[PDB]
Amino acid sequence: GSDLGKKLLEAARAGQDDEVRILMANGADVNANDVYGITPLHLAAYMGHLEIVEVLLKYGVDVNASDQFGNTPLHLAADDGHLEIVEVLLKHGTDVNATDTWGSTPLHLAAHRGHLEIVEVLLKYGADVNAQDKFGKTAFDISIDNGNEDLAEILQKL
Amino acid sequence: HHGSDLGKKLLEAARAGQDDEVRILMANGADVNANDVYGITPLHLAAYMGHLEIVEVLLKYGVDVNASDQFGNTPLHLAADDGHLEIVEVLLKHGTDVNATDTWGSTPLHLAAHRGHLEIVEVLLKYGADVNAQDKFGKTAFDISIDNGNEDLAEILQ
Amino acid sequence: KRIHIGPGRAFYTTXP
């Protein structure tokens, strides 16, 4: 039952790709979640486990899975600066403009953190530069508030 | 002009227990209340990991001692759970809510009870922990001690 | 660090 779900969450957190494959073969739900809606893919993205992300993708993971707070794994990877994970999630069709419960898209989070190379890739995959979070802020607005002139120059042209 | 990613570096330094790095980051304007996507702060991480020197550094810069992450964890929950008596003592002396409840309804007393940290239970009681508080499984700290057959703990909680 | 049951403890668990 959900015993395998707990085991799969932990294997994803620890980066044990062989254990992920074993648990899937045991019948683990690839989209298992804890009481906060957090899935193995969430934990792999948070922890920067590119190989786990790749394996879960092959086993049919849902890259649009959203937790209790509206985070998809793309939110987590974009906020923490994990370029490779951001790229593979986008390449497998994750919603580039998914919004958390405060209306932040991954572009917003990347802007907040000054992750220029992740902003570039998000834009490349169709990030919405005009999207406003619930505070009325676009990514460009965030870069102005933060004094990140490199980020603003990228976004202002758009 | 090119952004400052010191918040992330502080979180990483607190989690890694790099005492000198934390001092240096704080001395150069790092946000003492930086947090990640889940509201986890350097103090949360230092409290769970048992990094007392780092806790004290953050206290020199006016850290929010009662900050809650997205899961309802406060630093006092985390130090009480993982058995870091010295951090529990310090947090209590700096005005942390002794009966704060996480998303499971657990107070720090519940968590210390689950793990058999007798000294922590004692100091929590000294600072007014509520022995009648039931978590969302309906358990008091006393109930947990009985469920775990911990005679010493049951004696402390009467 | 070893995983422990608890709210969001996975995010607090890294390395040993």
Residue numbers in the entry:
A (entry chain C): 11 to 168
B (entry chain A): 9 to 166
C (entry chain B): 5 to 20
What text appears in the publication on this structure?
The V3 loop of the HIV-1 envelope (Env) protein elicits a vigorous, but largely non-neutralizing antibody response directed to the V3-crown, whereas rare broadly neutralizing antibodies (bnAbs) target the V3-base. Challenging this view, we present V3-crown directed broadly neutralizing Designed Ankyrin Repeat Proteins (bnDs) matching the breadth of V3-base bnAbs. While most bnAbs target prefusion Env, V3-crown bnDs bind open Env conformations triggered by CD4 engagement. BnDs achieve breadth by focusing on highly conserved residues that are accessible in two distinct V3 conformations, one of which resembles CCR5-bound V3.
5m3_D12 and 63_B7 were co-crystallized with V3-IY (MN). In contrast, V3-IY and V3-IF mimetics in complex with the three bnDs and 63_B7 adopted conformations that were different from their original design. In all cases, a loss of the mimetic’s β-hairpin conformation was observed. Despite this observation, the different V3-crown mimetics, as well as linear V3-crown peptide, were able to adopt the Post-CCR5-V3 conformation when in complex with 63_B7 and bnD.2. It should be noted that 63_B7 and bnD.2 were selected using different panning targets (V3-IY mimetic and CD4-bound gp120, respectively), thus highlighting again that a common transient conformation of the V3 must exist. Five shared resistance mutations highlighted the similarity between bnD.2 and 63_B7. These positions (T257, K282, P470, M475, W479) localize outside V3 near the interface of the gp120 inner and outer domains and involve residues of the CD4 binding site and/or layer 3, a structural element previously implicated in Env conformational transitions.
